[PDB]
Amino acid sequence: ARTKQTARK
Amino acid sequence: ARTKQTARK
Amino acid sequence: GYWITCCPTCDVDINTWVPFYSTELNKPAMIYCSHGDGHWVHAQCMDLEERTLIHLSEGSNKYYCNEHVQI
Amino acid sequence: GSPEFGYWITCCPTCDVDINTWVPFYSTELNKPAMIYCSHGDGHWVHAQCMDLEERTLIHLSEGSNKYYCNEHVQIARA
Amino acid sequence: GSPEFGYWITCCPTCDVDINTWVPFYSTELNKPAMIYCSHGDGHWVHAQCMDLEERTLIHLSNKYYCNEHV
Ligand SMILES: [Zn+2]
Ligand SMILES: [Zn+2]
Ligand SMILES: [Zn+2]
Ligand SMILES: [Zn+2]
Ligand SMILES: [Zn+2]
Ligand SMILES: [Zn+2]
Incomplete structure (x- = not known):
């Protein structure tokens, strides 16, 4: 599924 | 990489 | 699109939101x-x-929100 | 079969897999x-x-832990 | 239309579309x-x-179309 702000900092 | 049915048997 | 009311019980608010x-x-x-x-x-x-x-x-699995999960 | 489970599907234009003829490889x-x-x-x-x-x-x-791009997509400029 | 693998691919070398920032245009x-x-x-x-x-x-x-990279 496409998400937002799920990128690992 | 994600995989399926690749586990040691 | 970030500060929308996403569902009847939406708690995300631009005047109160904090990282979770x-x-x-x-x-x-x-x-x-x-x-x-x-x-x-x-x-x-x-x-x-x-x-x-x-x-x-x-x-790549699709997602359905708590409101739409059922057909 | 049932494609909703993800296995018995046509994975690519040249996909060979079919539950009726598949055999373990x-x-x-x-x-x-x-x-x-x-x-x-x-x-x-x-x-x-x-x-x-x-x-x-x-x-x-x-x-x-690497990502993989299939033979169909690997050469698509992925910038 | 509906592309097979989504709307978030980087379509060209100049592709400006980011799912985290994309807004209606x-x-x-x-x-x-x-x-x-x-x-x-x-x-x-x-x-x-x-x-x-x-x-x-x-x-x-x-009829048909060809992107900027192909005409
Ligand atoms: Zn919400
Ligand atoms: Zn929904
Ligand atoms: Zn296949
Ligand atoms: Zn692929
Ligand atoms: Zn683009
Ligand atoms: Zn083109």
Whole structure:
């Protein structure tokens, strides 16, 4: 599924 | 990489 | 599209929002619901635990919000 | 079969897999074909055999934490 | 239309579309960018915005089309 702000900092 | 049915048997 | 009211019980508010997931900083994590034309919802409003969110983000599986999961 | 479970599907234009004729090929298969995930676009799964992956290449890919792009997408400028 | 693998691919070298920042541009954009199909061979889907197509052109094209990289 496409998400937002799920990128690992 | 994600995989399926690749586990040691 | 971030500061929308994503569902009848939506708790994400631009005047009160704070990071909840370890991947959030100044913006709320969102996930795409594939129902009908589709629409975006805040992950937190769906009560998704973080690992579930992450797994969804790393796969190609479709997602349906708590409102649309049932056919 | 039921494609909703993800195995018995047509993974690519040259996909050979069909539950009626499939047989185990890799040493790790039982009743389901081994598959690997392609990170192209929104993603998708393809049968390892359809990609012509040799067992040690497939197992090598699964033990590592790298993404994989199928033979159909790997050459698409992915900037 | 509906591209096979989504609306979030980087369609061209100049691809400006990021799912985390993408906002509606065309008078029609809801939750996904507008795309068009370049018929150059295999044929690939490209973002209308990235081809700097003005809406009247977009709407009009919807014979055949070829992206900026192919004409
Ligand atoms: Zn919400
Ligand atoms: Zn929904
Ligand atoms: Zn296949
Ligand atoms: Zn692929
Ligand atoms: Zn683009
Ligand atoms: Zn083109």
